[PDB]
A paper describes a structure:
Double-drugging via active and allosteric sites is a recently developed approach to overcome these obstacles. Herein, we provide the quantitative framework for double-drugging using two targets: Aurora A kinase (AurA) and Abl. Both kinases participate in various cellular pathways, and their dysregulation results in a multitude of cancers, such as breast cancer and leukemia.
Thus, we reason that this 16-fold negative cooperativity for Mb1 binding arises from a conformational equilibrium shift of AurA to the inactive state induced by danusertib. Our crystal structures and ITC experiments showed that danusertib can bind to both the AurA-Mb2 and AurA-Mb1 complexes. We find that the enthalpy for danusertib binding to AurA-Mb1 is reduced by 22.8 kJ/mol compared to AurA-Mb2, which approximates the equivalence of one salt bridge [12.6 to 20.9 kJ/mol (33)]. We observed that K162-E181 indeed forms this salt bridge on average 80.8% in a 10 ns simulation.
Author numbering:
A (entry chain B): 9 to 96
B (entry chain A): 126 to 389
The structure:
């Protein structure tokens, strides 16, 4: 569902183009959360507008198991989270 | 907020659409006059334009510029889709052009100035309109230009931009020739628009779409004699076959013909 397109020891390029939405249910913005897999860190987050299909997460630790999660937050719905694990 | 039909007072119909009507409306909380566009879902899915509706709402809802028609929000029930839009009382630039046949240089340069300011705002967000034409332009209370209809718009980093879209007389050549396109297609259609404002007809008009695609691809157009040298210079700079040669909107606003004729 979620896909990592490009890779860099300090940056990742994710894309949620495969995530299909309900008809007449339009997305307002996205909540993208990333952090060390299995850890107890607070997990960093940020938002992009709803018309985005890709996003660039920068400033990460090389050689670290990360968990990328995207929350599609529509104007009248909250879609199920989609995740992916990628090692920088 | 969770908008609904119960939140607006509905008045007379303002105009007609392809899949519904636009009504004059008022938000009961603030008594603020707005425009309510109704779109019947049955007429939408029959035309297969639902994806363009999703594009217009998800993009235009984030654009806040004095020369862009605001989309305050939307909602929908079982049969219709509602768009809460900014009220433009003076109508479309298309009807004003039908009345006056053609615009003078002062009114045209002021329109191009306002349109370039809104496009510079859109391009600053990597948003391309891809459908600039007089039928998509509304006029504000003081006569200011407002760009509407963002169904063909696109977020450049979120698309490959290899599919042809827009209006026949305003299509850029890179689209007809099947090449990847970017923000420069708005610069081409801006030059096509500047020609129609001063002349009254688009430059690549033809009796069939075969010839129009051919005339655009080869940039085959001429100016009437009443077009001043400053206007020909801008249109020629905008109607370049190579998208990289087309100027930046910052330079269009700084062009001597705009500087000497635009009111804004
Ligand atoms: C069909 O969608 C509408 C749309 O979305 N919209 C959103 C929105 N907001 N305000 C609008 N104004 C009018 O529809 C309108 C029509 C005629 C009018 N007059 C006619 C009579 N005159 C004596 C005075 C002026 C004045 C205003 C519209 C249309 C649209 C139409 C054209 C371009 C872009 C969008």
């Amino acid at each position: 569902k979620l896909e990592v397109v490009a890779a860099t020891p300090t940056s990742l390029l994710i894309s949620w183009d495969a995530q299909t939405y309900q008809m007449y249910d339009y997305v307002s913005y996205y909540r993208i959360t990333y952090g060390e897999t299995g850890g107890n860190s607070p997990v960093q987050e940020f938002t992009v507008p709803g018309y985005y299909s890709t996003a660039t997460i920068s400033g990460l630790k090389p050689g670290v198991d990360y968990t990328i999660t995207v929350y599609a937050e529509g104007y009248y719905s909250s879609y199920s989270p989609i995740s992916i694990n990628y090692r920088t | 907020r969770q908008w609904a039909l119960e939140d607006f007072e509905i008045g007379r119909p303002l105009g007609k659409g392809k899949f519904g009507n636009v009504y004059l409306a008022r938000e009961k909380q603030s008594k603020f006059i707005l425009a309510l566009k109704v779109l019947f879902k049955a007429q939408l899915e029959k035309a297969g334009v639902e994806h363009q509706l999703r594009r217009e709402v998800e993009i235009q809802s984030h654009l806040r510029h004095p020369n862009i028609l605001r989309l305050y929000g939307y909602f929908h029930d079982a049969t219709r889709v509602y768009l809460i839009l900014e009220y433009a009382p003076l109508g479309t630039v298309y009807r004003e052009l039908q009345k006056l046949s053609k615009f003078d240089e002062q009114r045209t340069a002021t329109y191009i100035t306002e349109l370039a300011n809104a496009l510079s705002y859109c391009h600053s967000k990597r948003v391309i309109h891809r459908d600039i034409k007089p039928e998509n332009l509304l006029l504000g209370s003081a006569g200011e230009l407002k760009i509407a209809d963002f169904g063909w718009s696109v977020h450049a980093p979120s698309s490959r931009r290899t599919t042809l879209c827009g209006t026949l007389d305003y299509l850029p050549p890179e689209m007809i020739e099947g090449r990847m396109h970017d923000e420069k297609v708005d610069l081409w259609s801006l030059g096509v628009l500047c020609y129609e404002f001063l002349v009254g007809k688009p430059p690549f008009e033809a009796n069939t779409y075969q010839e129009t695609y051919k005339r655009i691809s080869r940039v085959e157009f001429t100016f009437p004699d009443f077009v001043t040298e400053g206007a020909r210079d801008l249109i020629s700079r905008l109607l370049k076959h190579n998208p990289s040669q087309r100027p930046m909107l910052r330079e269009v606003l700084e062009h001597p013909w705009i500087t000497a004729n635009s009111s804004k």
